[PDB]
Amino acid sequence: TTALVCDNGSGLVKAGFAGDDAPRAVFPSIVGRPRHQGVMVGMGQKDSYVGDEAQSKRGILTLKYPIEHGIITNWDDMEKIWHHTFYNELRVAPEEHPTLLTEAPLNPKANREKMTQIMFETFNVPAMYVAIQAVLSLYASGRTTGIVLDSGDGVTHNVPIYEGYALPHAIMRLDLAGRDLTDYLMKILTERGYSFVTTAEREIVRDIKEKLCYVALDFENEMATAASSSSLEKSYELPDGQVITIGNERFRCPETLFQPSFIGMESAGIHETTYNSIMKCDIDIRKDLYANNVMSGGTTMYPGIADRMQKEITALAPSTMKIKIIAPPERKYSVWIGGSILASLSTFQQMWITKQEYDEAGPSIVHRKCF
Amino acid sequence: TTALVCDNGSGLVKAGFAGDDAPRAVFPSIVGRPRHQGVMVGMGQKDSYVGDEAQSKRGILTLKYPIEHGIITNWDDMEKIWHHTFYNELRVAPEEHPTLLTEAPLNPKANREKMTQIMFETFNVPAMYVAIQAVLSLYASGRTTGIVLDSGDGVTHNVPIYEGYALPHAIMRLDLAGRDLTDYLMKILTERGYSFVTTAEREIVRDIKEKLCYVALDFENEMATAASSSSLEKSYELPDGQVITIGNERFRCPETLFQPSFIGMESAGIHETTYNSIMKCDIDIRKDLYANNVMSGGTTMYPGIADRMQKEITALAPSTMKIKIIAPPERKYSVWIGGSILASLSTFQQMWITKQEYDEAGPSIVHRKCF
Amino acid sequence: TTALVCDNGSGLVKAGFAGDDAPRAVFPSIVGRPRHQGVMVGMGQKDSYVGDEAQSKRGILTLKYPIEHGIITNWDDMEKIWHHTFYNELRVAPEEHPTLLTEAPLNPKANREKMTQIMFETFNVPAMYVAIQAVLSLYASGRTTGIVLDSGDGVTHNVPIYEGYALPHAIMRLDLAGRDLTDYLMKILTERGYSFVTTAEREIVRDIKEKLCYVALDFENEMATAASSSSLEKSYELPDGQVITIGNERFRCPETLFQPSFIGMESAGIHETTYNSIMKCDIDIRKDLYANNVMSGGTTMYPGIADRMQKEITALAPSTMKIKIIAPPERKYSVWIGGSILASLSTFQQMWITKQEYDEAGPSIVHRKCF
Amino acid sequence: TTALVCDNGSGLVKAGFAGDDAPRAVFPSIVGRPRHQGVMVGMGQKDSYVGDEAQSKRGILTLKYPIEHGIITNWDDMEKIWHHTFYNELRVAPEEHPTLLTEAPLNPKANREKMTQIMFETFNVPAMYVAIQAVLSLYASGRTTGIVLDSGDGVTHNVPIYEGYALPHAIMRLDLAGRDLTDYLMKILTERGYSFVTTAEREIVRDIKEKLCYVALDFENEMATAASSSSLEKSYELPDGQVITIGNERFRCPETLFQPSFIGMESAGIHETTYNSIMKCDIDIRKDLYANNVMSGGTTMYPGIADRMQKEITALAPSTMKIKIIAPPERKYSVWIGGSILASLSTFQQMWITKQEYDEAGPSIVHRKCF
Amino acid sequence: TTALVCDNGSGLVKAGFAGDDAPRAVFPSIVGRPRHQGVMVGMGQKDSYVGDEAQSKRGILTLKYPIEHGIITNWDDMEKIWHHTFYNELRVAPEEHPTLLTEAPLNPKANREKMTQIMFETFNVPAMYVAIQAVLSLYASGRTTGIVLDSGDGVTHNVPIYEGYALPHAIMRLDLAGRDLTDYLMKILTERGYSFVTTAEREIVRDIKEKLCYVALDFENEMATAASSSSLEKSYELPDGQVITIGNERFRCPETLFQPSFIGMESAGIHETTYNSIMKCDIDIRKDLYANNVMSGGTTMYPGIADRMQKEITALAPSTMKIKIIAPPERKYSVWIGGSILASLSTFQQMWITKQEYDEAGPSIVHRKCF
Ligand SMILES: Nc1ncnc2c1ncn2[C@@H]1O[C@H](COP(=O)(O)OP(=O)(O)O)[C@@H](O)[C@H]1O
Ligand SMILES: Nc1ncnc2c1ncn2[C@@H]1O[C@H](COP(=O)(O)OP(=O)(O)O)[C@@H](O)[C@H]1O
Ligand SMILES: Nc1ncnc2c1ncn2[C@@H]1O[C@H](COP(=O)(O)OP(=O)(O)O)[C@@H](O)[C@H]1O
Ligand SMILES: Nc1ncnc2c1ncn2[C@@H]1O[C@H](COP(=O)(O)OP(=O)(O)O)[C@@H](O)[C@H]1O
Ligand SMILES: Nc1ncnc2c1ncn2[C@@H]1O[C@H](COP(=O)(O)OP(=O)(O)O)[C@@H](O)[C@H]1O
Ligand SMILES: [Mg+2]
Ligand SMILES: [Mg+2]
Ligand SMILES: [Mg+2]
Ligand SMILES: [Mg+2]
Ligand SMILES: [Mg+2]
């Protein structure tokens, strides 16, 4: 039979079937609830809205994200979202399709324990498996060597792999991703007089960010150019017809990835994190790691991010080494693509967590069965 | 020489001289214009009235506030008010006294740019400086550690400071202040048959609010007590001799600070905003922030507001931490007091924005010179 | 006159006077610098903090260790720390007191060359000397026979001595010490949901480790016991009032000493290193080495480390030999104690590196004068 | 038919066919096993790697040498290496080719007994023979008189032969060879800040040693020259792009052959060992031994070793005697060359240990059949 | 007064006083010097160790024998040993006690000349005398007829005496003694995997030899028995706790006395040497020589040596003659016993070499005064 692949990200939900080349269902990972009082009678109004329906009537709802920083904080909302994916989007019965789930490294173990418990108790999937997203990204890339820089909506992590062997002591994690960039853009848009406060306005700011932001090759020169001329200014139209203009905020927002101190964080940029992860590996494998930098996730879709990353890593690495940044045009769904590839493998079918094993071993089977 | 300190708030204007302990001039920040047709000849009537004069003949004028939400919307009226303060109230020549101005955080930059331009072009002040009101409140408090909750007439903001170092990523702003409370009281007074519509009636309602309103320690119990008995009812006399009676509207109006949903806002209460600002700071400085909650502004003068804030924050913070709310009896003028203290410092005299620097660097000198 | 003894470790600084039985000054070897922007004026804030002062205001500073793995990487910070020790802690003038310094074996020679250059040029000490820390530990033990296992914050080394004669071909070194254990504990605390990232949080994790960790006599049995029951779980209170609970991480962290593969190292455990060092010595001196195992350093202060070491070495050594582990209660300062003992010897005064010898022979005099 | 010649050294394996002038297969004598955890599925990864394959993926493996000091310590690994040589390198069937093996003198007898047992039981060679490596070196030299100084990777031995007659009472052995030199170079490279610890780093250090080391004609003068000038310094590039610089360590490493006390050994140098072996022979044969010093093995390939040996022996021997050191350019494979020559002799075919003799006489036939 | 008797052997020193029945001081004839570098200060370490003190700290010293083959090769070490005997062992003043010394026959004359010169110049003995050790052995035996077979540590000699008359043309000498046996045992212990190389390991091997070796009555039958069964195998415990097992090496080592070709010597066995010495005497004295074979020295203390000697000589001598081997249980000190007996004789006091005779006749007086 066919197996389901679900990539439960912080912001988006990517669901589909193993063997396909693109997710069947992609929609925001939000749940909305009304915040006003209803006066019409017989409208058949619901008490909650999930996905694109919540984004539709977002002017009267309060939107909540069940996942923050790759960690599920609301489990009732997560069950609602999983039910939505399984019934109203994929339109399948989760009793005959094994389901493949993803998770960021260095997460709490209770997260995956509860994921397995919900999958086997609330739903009746015959088997399930939890895979590291960077491994799936490297599967999608078609290679078995390289360090993967995955940046989605909640977390950013690096995982180096040499010959199918992972070096877990060199895995580095960062709680700086797209949502922090959206909040920073919201904060810095107030300098021009634009005030976005509500969650619906947060969605507006997210759309502005993902439609008008880019990474500058040289930050100081770009700031000087923006200050001098006005060619970098762009206009955006609000839903009510108002037009706002954005100048240096276009590239000041993605700059937080390379200078996390813009949002009060002491951590290092993504380039320095990648270099530190590489330098924690064996000296004989560093050359192949320098030439196989793989990027994945929505936050890696900014224009000019790959060139900036290559420039920074070249400035860090020695001159003799060759630095290659591998950013496929479909890296926004590379985790799901690799998950589908892994679930479609003939030799992978012996590593599913079957129902009998879960019943005999409790929810702790996931730790020993899954890396 | 002596330097001027001007606290241009949304509702009130606090002006005076550095080194004093109280503002010299305090008057409403309104400009009035006649709305009827004159029949007497030779009365020497003016076309505009500023300050207490407008409040005197408010039965024949239309009153306008030049500032909404800490942002100056009318600049001709603001110039009129500044001229009033400099000539008819302080009775000084603004050419030999440096002037210290205040501004709320996260305001548009054009606001302070135009403030500097007006101060250096319309008037001829030798130097000027713009300071954050929360920093001045902490100066007045006599301490260099703590989170300040300033609530005036247009805005409410929180600014945490540990050892003279501000954490700008933890600053939170709220466009809910005294004017919204006055509008809400006007709206809810119609339930008893009292209809106030005009701007002069808005001043009447503001006086009723600031003379008869208080914050309830427990809102539901207070509502039950008001419904059961009649001891909470108070009487107010209108200018024409009519007497109105107010019941649960006395504490239903200030409750909007802790439940902003009463006026259709999705934001969180002041207690939750303070807790969120504290939790955005470093873990090693949170203990000193919990014990140094400083309140300032006119909107913090409601009876029982400090006890309610302490109760809510204690309910939010862990049991081991000690919560102290610092509400001095003179917190209505603490911003001006701190501004005077800062302007009277010997080591502060090197940070004035002199006329030559403004001339060479344009109106953009304020951003680099002032935090 | 009196001579100074300074034990410049990776984590701690132990300074004092020769002839005493305890260091006069002990404080962390860190330098902190502000990472936020200051708003108060006239606070007299400094640009750097050294020692306990940095640990005080660690919520607003970035902390750096000038020494990694017993090698000084930052020399300006090291000069700052030495100035701190000489002036603000010992309160003496380093021009009439000869200073005794310590260093780990198999260090770069430029390290001690620059140490001598700084001591004779930046300061004006009349004489100085560099001693191996294991020799000082054996001096403190009061015996002249035995192999010393010194483990501080950056390095772990073994040095066997028979009759005052060292066997340098049997000296073994290991770059696994307390800082690696702190990093491993930080990494494995994320499994329970606790995220410590900043340097101040690194200090928090170090305190948790040194107040709640121990060495298990049998690792697998301890893991089984921790999995079955909950008697091994302990609670710790964070500075902000939050309480965290630690289970098997209490003994999983010190286990890295005996199984260095937990942090991706191919090296052997401390017991195997000690056995290999003993087996590299002459057959006629091995019996006295088996019965004189001396431990020193802070990393040797874990509960149950001595019993585990004895058990492992007994399992390695032949049955007839007698294994004794000598772990005095004051082994945390045994290097300093032995240095004081050596500096107080009457027959040692002829081996100081005087100023004239340094002037005539350059900084290379340390190699020929010191072992 | 053709007979196989296998020179199982400590570091290298030299295999081929009798009658040829060069070994067919030369590769390191190592077996590698993974030390990390695999995450890719379907890679077809092996559990062990032998030879150059282990040297390829050495950044993720732990490398072990089955032979130390000419003595086989691991027999499963030795069987793996023999299978590799017989199948993946020579690509022959070891059932119709008699195999000639080599062994150092004064080895344990169980070593050759087990070699014969493995050759006749695990494989089915029709016949086999064990020859002394010095005799094969003298065969390759084309002469039947002289003392042979063979130094490979584990052992160094001297064997004097006059007219085809060996003097076994004058054979001298030394457990100081290339591996000790590699370990010493690793130890003394830490003085410049370079730290090599892992087995792969041991291979790196071995490459540095065999590409940058030489024997100084006069050690003290060379040390003075290296200290004074900098013309003796050379640079080496690490696999990750880092560049290291080596000074007097180039000739300080090979000096251990003439001064074994550098690594804590009480033995005498190779020159003194050769002189002592010569002086243990009859007085009438010493003159021909002085003029037929033959060197063999990889450790004899250092530049300037032959001149130094001649100088030392001339200083030891009387003035009238003539000292000649015979170091052919192909002495790295002279043992294999002599073994091929011996196996290709028509008169040697009667001294093979046939299968019937082994079956009737047990594994002890090797002692009586082979010298 | 009392006279001193000193038996300066190759391995042992036997000193005492004339008239006693056992030597007062017996200790090894070695001098040790440190070979490592000292790190402790104030240990009062010496630069040389003599006797049992050298055997104590032999794991850090290099041991040298001043005497090889009964010939003194190092004279500074010999002076050190003589000073040790005279002061730290006998505790007497060598100025009032005449000293009796011993020497092997057919030694260089310069040996005894320098012995006399040292005794009369470095020390101030009133008189001295050099006696042949075989004559002293025959004195100890209490008879004046017979051939003496003395075998110590360096030499083996035969001296036949008939009626107090020596036949110097029949004296035979052999440079095969205990030290050669120790070296042979060291060489043949490598066949079982035991490697002893250092001088301290030479002492270990000497102890093993003198505690586990014996002479086989029939060598070939003993070899067959050892090969067949395992009852001849014995175990020995090394100082570090390791246990070694010795089989046919127990009797293969003493066999070198009867088959000197085992160590590459062309000479004849001790039995054949004794027979040849007897056959060089007059035919009328051979019968009394056949029946008075006297053995002395440590090398004659092997079990079964006397029976083997009797069997061999009986096989050589004609059937009618009666062969008696006289091996007293105290033959290890028979030379010293006979020297004491000779020095205690009243009629011997006229043959001392007085100081005046030495002064007038130079060091050559010993040749004419002593046989
Ligand atoms: N073209 C784009 N440019 C910049 N940011 C983008 C773009 N597309 C998506 N993003 C950001 O990436 C995030 C989605 O990343 P995704 O890979 O779905 O994360 P997750 O794996 O956690 O679901 C969104 O928050 C969005 O703001
Ligand atoms: N005693 C009081 N009780 C309740 N509200 C008050 C009281 N005094 C003043 N206010 C309110 O506070 C506002 C003035 O606050 P102020 O600090 O002057 O604001 P700003 O700093 O913007 O001028 C007025 O709108 C008034 O309604
Ligand atoms: N009681 C304890 N238990 C476990 N670890 C400890 C204890 N006390 C100190 N340590 C660790 O030992 C280190 C200090 O060791 P120290 O001997 O000062 O090293 P150094 O000689 O390099 O200064 C610290 O990093 C600390 O984490
Ligand atoms: N050109 C060279 N210079 C110095 N050392 C070398 C050189 N070539 C090889 N070696 C050393 O010699 C050793 C190989 O010697 P080899 O004769 O193969 O020993 P074996 O007979 O035990 O296999 C290696 O360990 C290597 O370090
Ligand atoms: N019981 C014994 N069995 C075998 N050999 C012995 C025994 N006792 C001593 N020896 C050997 O005899 C030697 C000592 O002989 P000794 O008579 O002291 O010689 P010397 O007269 O030259 O000092 C030692 O080298 C020792 O190895
Ligand atoms: Mg994702
Ligand atoms: Mg204000
Ligand atoms: Mg230390
Ligand atoms: Mg070889
Ligand atoms: Mg003797």
Residue numbers in the entry:
A (entry chain E), B (entry chain C), C (entry chain B), D (entry chain D), E (entry chain A): 5 to 375
Task: Give verbatim excerpts from the published study on this entry.
The motor protein myosin-15 is necessary for the development and maintenance of mechanosensory stereocilia, and mutations in myosin-15 cause hereditary deafness. Unconventional myosin-15 (encoded by the Myo15a gene in mouse and MYO15A in humans) is a plus-end directed molecular motor essential for stereocilia development and maintenance. Here, we present cryo–electron microscopy structures of myosin-15 bound to F-actin, providing a framework for interpreting the impacts of deafness mutations on motor activity and actin nucleation. We propose myosin-15 enhances polymerization by bridging actin protomers, regulating nucleation efficiency by modulating actin’s structural plasticity in a myosin nucleotide state–dependent manner.
Several recent high-resolution cryo-EM studies of F-actin have indicated that the D-loop is structurally dynamic within the context of the filament. Our F-actin alone structure reveals a region of the D-loop (residues G48-Q49) that is structurally flexible but nevertheless primarily adopts a mixture of two conformations. At a high threshold (0.036 RMS), our map of bare F-actin features ambiguity surrounding residues G48 and Q49, despite clear density for all other residues in the D-loop. On the basis of the respective strengths of the two density paths, the Out conformation is predominant in the bare F-actin structure, likely stabilized by an interaction between the side chain of Q49 of subunit i + 2 and the side chain of Y169 from the adjacent subunit i. Three of the classes (1, 2, and 4), corresponding to 80.5% of the particles, display clear and continuous main chain density for G48 and Q49 in the Out conformation. However, none of these three classes displays discernable density for the In conformation, even at low (0.015 RMS) thresholds, indicating that the D-loop in these classes predominantly adopts the Out conformation. Class 3, corresponding to 19.5% of the particles, instead showed discontinuous density for the main chain spanning G48 and Q49 at a high threshold (0.018 RMS). In contrast to the predominant Out conformation in classes 1, 2, and 4, the density for the In conformation is moderately stronger than the Out conformation in class 3, implying that the D-loop still represents a mixture of states but preferably assumes the In conformation. This analysis further supports a model in which the D-loop of bare F-actin dynamically samples two conformations, with the Out conformation being predominant. The data we present here reveal the closed D-loop conformation in ADP F-actin to be a mixture of In and Out states whose occupancy can be manipulated by myosin-15 engagement.
